[PDB]
Design a binder for this molecule. Structure first.
Ligand SMILES: *C(=O)N1C[C@H](NOS(=O)(=O)O)CC[C@H]1C(N)=O
Length: 269
């Protein structure tokens, strides 16, 4: 109870970090001005599943120079299946389109779909090369599922920073890294995400149309990265949130991310 009350009472990111005895990295980015507010914006955190947003972007980018790549069918083998494979588990022994694998990995965070897409694009090195070409010198993809979700202090594999990921979401989901139809498809997948109802979305008011991608690991990490489109029109905002908080429960980590959303909504005003 005391921890829950301290989380609810926190009105700024530093106080919220203290309330959960964690390490919290947040960037709130105004795309009209480039202005950012946050906490630990340039510290490294494990991407965990949040990298899947950029794996899908790498696929879409490759499809712009490989006609019909999105329609290519990829076998789903029994040996490819992992514990978290909510969509691909139904297709073991048959195949799925690249496009449907992308959707599955964004909106359900399907780990098998991510590994199959890694095989399509050329692995973590291809995702990192896409990130670098897009202008992100910080974020890096190094490993496959599920090993990529590990984190060690000082080990930069599969990490980002809140500010690097916020800028990348702007360039890729809103900017000109991808062709318009490609970026719109990616935006739609993020808008359709099914795993974030208790995270940033739970703290953001109805004035925002939200697209997001979550992530977590079993030790202490819980993340959510989001694009906020004002339903009334105007410039979008980007909100990234990376948390490590081993002293609280998985469900309390969601509460922290929801509180990030409530604080951010108030700061936008
Ligand atoms: C991604 O971080 N993961 C995939 C899956 N879904 O969780 S998410 O919805 O938060 O992404 C299980 C947890 C995690 C993982 N360990 O792979």
């Amino acid at each position: 109870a005391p921890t829950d009350a301290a989380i609810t009472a926190a009105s700024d990111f530093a106080a919220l970090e203290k309330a959960c005895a964690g390490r919290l990295g947040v960037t709130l980015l105004d795309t009209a001005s480039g202005r950012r507010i946050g906490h630990r914006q340039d510290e490294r955190f494990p991407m965990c599943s949040t990298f899947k947003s950029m794996l899908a972007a790498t696929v879409l980018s490759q499809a712009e120079r490989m006609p019909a790549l999105l329609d290519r069918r990829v076998p789903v083998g029994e040996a490819d299946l992992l514990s978290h494979a909510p969509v691909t588990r139904r297709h073991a022994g048959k195949d799925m389109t690249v496009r449907d694998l992308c959707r599955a990995t964004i909106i359900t965070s399907d780990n098998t779909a991510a590994n199959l897409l890694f095989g399509v694009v050329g692995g973590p090195p291809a995702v990192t090369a896409f990130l670098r070409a897009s202008g992100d010198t910080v974020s890096r993809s190094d490993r496959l599922e599920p090993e990529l979700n590990s984190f060690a202090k000082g080990d930069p594999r599969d990490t980002t920073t809140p500010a690097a990921m916020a800028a990348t979401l702007q360039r890729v989901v809103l900017g000109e890294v991808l062709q318009p139809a490609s970026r719109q498809q990616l935006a739609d997948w993020l808008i359709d995400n099914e795993t974030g109802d208790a995270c940033l979305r739970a703290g953001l008011g109805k004035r925002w149309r939200v697209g997001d991608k979550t992530g977590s690991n079993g030790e202490d990490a819980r993340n959510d990265i989001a694009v906020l489109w004002p339903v009334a029109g105007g410039a979008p905002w980007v909100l990234t949130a990376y948390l490590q908080a081993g002293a609280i429960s998985y469900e309390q980590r969601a509460s922290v991310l929801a509180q990030v959303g409530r604080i951010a909504d108030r700061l936008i005003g």
